[PDB]
Amino acid sequence: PLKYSYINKCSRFLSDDRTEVPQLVNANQYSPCVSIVPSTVWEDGDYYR
């Protein structure tokens, strides 16, 4: 790999802009956040929405 990478956060913001919902990965399932994250993380601490 160009760099080894991982997702160190996965949550969804609540529509009211005051709270946030965490999303731990389910056993034997891809995290939902994979739909936005790039095939590699371009820089450490990158975040996406």
- Name the residues that contact a copy of itself, by CB under 8 A: 16-18, 28-30, 35
- Residue 4 or residue 22: which is nearer to a copy of itself going by CB? 22
CB of 4 to a copy of itself, least distance (A): 24
- Residue 6 or residue 30: which is nearer to a copy of itself going by CB? 30
User: Phi, psi at residue 34, to the nearest 5°?
Assistant: -60, -30
Within 13 A of 42's CA, how many CA atoms are on the CB side?
Answer: 5
Q: How many CB atoms lie within 10 A of CB 37?
A: 16
CB of 23 to a copy of itself, least distance (A): 14
